[PDB]
Amino acid sequence: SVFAYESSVHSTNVLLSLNDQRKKDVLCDVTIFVEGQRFRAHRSVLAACSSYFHSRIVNITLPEEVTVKGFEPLIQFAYTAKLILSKENVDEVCKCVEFLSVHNIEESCFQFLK
Amino acid sequence: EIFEVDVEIAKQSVTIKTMLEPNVNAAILKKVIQWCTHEKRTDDIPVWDQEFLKVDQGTLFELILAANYLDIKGLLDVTCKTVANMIKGKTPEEIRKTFNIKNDFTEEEEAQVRKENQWCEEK
């Protein structure tokens, strides 16, 4: 007889903890330079979320096409599994997701406000 | 105003403890002092409080107001138990004639409210 303790809150707790580490800049590994502005993140989480960063990593300088306004919510979404959107930045976040190939997000959310 | 010196008569009360750390000055505080000295079914009401609340309806309602102002949970609970006991077994029309409550409703609103809750009329 072999049992298996399954936890439904471990993944969310780990994500919240990682967001705490990123906010406090403790055990942050990857620095991203977008429009001359520096962003701290974890290499593992970035490679896990987006396949673009997964290929790039395996000091990232994002291309001039993307914008800080379209990338800042994406880091919070990656580290918290929740995305905050507005009327001005909906298209920015949409094309940022398309360029970065971020997984687990739904394009229906973008198209609802489009 | 004509308040007894001992603090044990106000320990049960909650409102006084706010500014410690008055409605009227009629016999209501005397009744409150007497009460202080001595499922949520109301059939287990104590005999002392039941026989102590034999005052008229107006005095009972004044005591209810005084207890609510004083935040005395026990006295408010006892008075509400008495009111519910004297309410039980009476149809809404009987209750309204007993308490002289004016009707501010309309006949189809009454129809739909007594239709929506029609399980209780069964025996």
């Binding site: 298996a4 399954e6 439904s8 | 609510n68 009111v83 409550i101 409210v113 809750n117």
Partner: protein, 341 residues
């Protein structure tokens, strides 16, 4: 000043109407607009389950005790022992005794385990009947699903299960499944592979659902249910072993507030099983739970495994066969349903 007190002081009216039972509450609902708001808001606080036991006896007993019930039921649950209920006239009488919108579930079983009404601390007994009046709790969405044995059809379409809230439901926590005149295995194994607590058994017949064979049960949907289950198998045969397994169950740390302990026993065990003793599982349950009223039956077969489902974790045994873990016989199943707070 008489009318002023009940027409301007809403708190006084609320505290007065709190002592009014649900039936008189709905009587006085139509007194006034303020009284209507007061009765609705008092109904909003009616979240506790209430049971009307009967130490037929129960059908009239609830008729006497329906005037002292402080809640308005939505999903009534009741059970009755075999020879007292058995005879659909009594089932219809109990059907007409409940509100039209109140879905009613009724079971007939060889045995009945029930504690005296009023307080859950009372020591339960084994055998009459009982009742369980689930109100319209916020969040919890019990639905008494029923699946009858089709003569020609044998498969169960997915729309049938999704409509009754079994599948396509990420919130379902406890499924109580009973089988009468036992198709039970196929229905259970249809949703046995979920992260839910499956507890139940084999019963005689179904009384009320607003002969034949099938699966009758309830789906305790909602995100605040935290349950647990143990299997007092053949290794438990005396008081010490039963108390040890009850300690094992208590280790799951299921809250005792708004909680029913469903004992899903076997008809073939009990006084004839335990050597020179009776009421061993009920006594142990009351010892380790001075609350949590003990209900269930003495079923022909048992459905359940040692699982712990809460809002934070699931502790399920890993099995080679998905449905071999659940179905049992000559065992005991002490499910612990908790309906949030």
């Amino acid at each position: 000043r008489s009318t002023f007190v009940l027409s301007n002081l809403a708190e006084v009216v609320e505290r007065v109407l709190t002592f009014l039972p649900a039936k008189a509450l709905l009587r006085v609902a139509c007194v006034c607009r303020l009284w209507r708001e007061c009765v609705r808001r008092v109904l909003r606080t009616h979240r506790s389950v209430t049971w009307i036991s009967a130490g037929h006896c129960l059908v009239r007993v609830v008729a006497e005790e329906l005037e002292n019930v402080r809640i308005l039921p939505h999903t009534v649950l009741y059970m009755a022992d075999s020879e007292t209920f058995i005879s659909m006239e009594t089932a219809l009488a109990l059907e007409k005794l409940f509100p039209k919108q109140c879905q009613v579930l009724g079971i007939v079983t060889p045995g009945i385990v029930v504690t005296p009404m009023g307080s859950g601390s009372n020591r339960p007994q084994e055998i009459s009947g009982f009742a369980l009046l689930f109100p319209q709790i916020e969040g919890i969405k019990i639905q008494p699903f029923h699946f009858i044995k089709d003569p020609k059809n044998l498969t169960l379409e997915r729309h049938q299960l999704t409509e009754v809230g079994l599948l396509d439901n990420p919130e379902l926590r406890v499924v109580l499944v009973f089988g009468y005149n036992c198709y039970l295995q196929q229905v259970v194994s249809t949703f046995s592979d979920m992260n839910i607590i499956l507890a139940g058994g084999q019963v005689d017949n179904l009384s009320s659902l607003t002969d034949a064979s099938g699966v009758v049960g309830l789906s305790f949907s909602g995100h605040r249910i935290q349950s647990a289950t143990v299997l007092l198998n053949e290794d438990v045969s005396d008081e010490k072993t039963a108390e040890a397994a009850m300690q094992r169950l208590k280790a799951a740390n299921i809250p005792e507030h708004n909680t029913i302990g469903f004992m899903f026993a076997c008809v073939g065990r009990g006084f004839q099983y335990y050597r020179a003793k009776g009421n061993v599982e009920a006594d142990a349950f009351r010892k380790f739970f001075p609350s949590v009223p003990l209900f269930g039956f003495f079923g022909n077969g048992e459905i359940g495994c040692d699982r712990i489902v809460t809002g934070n974790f699931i502790l399920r045994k890993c099995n080679e066969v998905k449905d071999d873990d659940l179905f049992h016989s000559y065992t005991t199943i002490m499910a612990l349903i908790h309906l949030g707070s």
